[PDB]
Design a protein around this ligand. Sequence first.
Ligand SMILES: CN1CCN(c2ccc(OCc3ccccc3)c(C(=O)Nc3cccnc3)c2)CC1
Length: 259
Amino acid sequence: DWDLVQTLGEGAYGEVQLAVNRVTEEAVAVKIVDMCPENIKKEICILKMLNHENVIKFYGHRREGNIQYLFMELASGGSLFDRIEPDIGMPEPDAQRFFHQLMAGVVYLHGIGITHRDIKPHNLLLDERDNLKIADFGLATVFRYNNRERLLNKMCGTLPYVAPELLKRREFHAEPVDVWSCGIVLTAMLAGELPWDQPSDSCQEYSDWKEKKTYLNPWKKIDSAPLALLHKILVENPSARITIPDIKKDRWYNKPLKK
Ligand SMILES: CN1CCN(c2ccc(OCc3ccccc3)c(C(=O)Nc3cccnc3)c2)CC1
């Protein structure tokens, strides 16, 4: 009833495919999961909670054997990853726009008590007018329910995007962790390279940054205004790390750059 036409990439669990309807030629994206059930139950539940202009749309789901099918709005612009030119990044106004939209999507998810846990360019996709959409909720989980915050006690994500505390701490707050990874995405956008393999005490590039060696790459490619915001995001202490309301007050964030 659908034709798997091309493989888009790997989602959290399984694969996601471009599928085009046999009857109507509707272009759609499908995640195929060969059936865990609690985890699939969880992911599906969270998907139906979502309604926002910078989050991907969810359609529905169907099982054959222990295969589950989840359909989502196809991202006709492809991925943000493809717009990052290696070693160079992208123009500053394109990066600021994408950043603005990312914070809106992140503000929305935190307002409903959801954390994505794997913000990085491959999970940030584009529609036809190039607006950013946050995709894939296989690692997402609840951090606030009936007004009470739950700390996270489990490691996940992608090492170059993960906050240091998630490697060193038994438990930690969800929100500052999404804020870190948003700064590594802004870094990638403005420089076309990632700052370190992982934010760990044995990683020499991360040590270089803590001691403020911003005469080195990638920092030397970034203008002093965006650099000053990155100074507040990539802070080791999660309690002193800038929060999203304050990111909205940052100089570069409110700088006019784009027609
Ligand atoms: C002509 N263009 C070329 C570029 N096109 C394109 C390229 C990559 C994509 O995702 C890679 C991916 C991202 C995350 C995880 C695995 C794989 C998607 C896409 O829409 N995927 C998607 C949508 C909704 C939910 N999940 C994934 C669409 C669309 C057609």
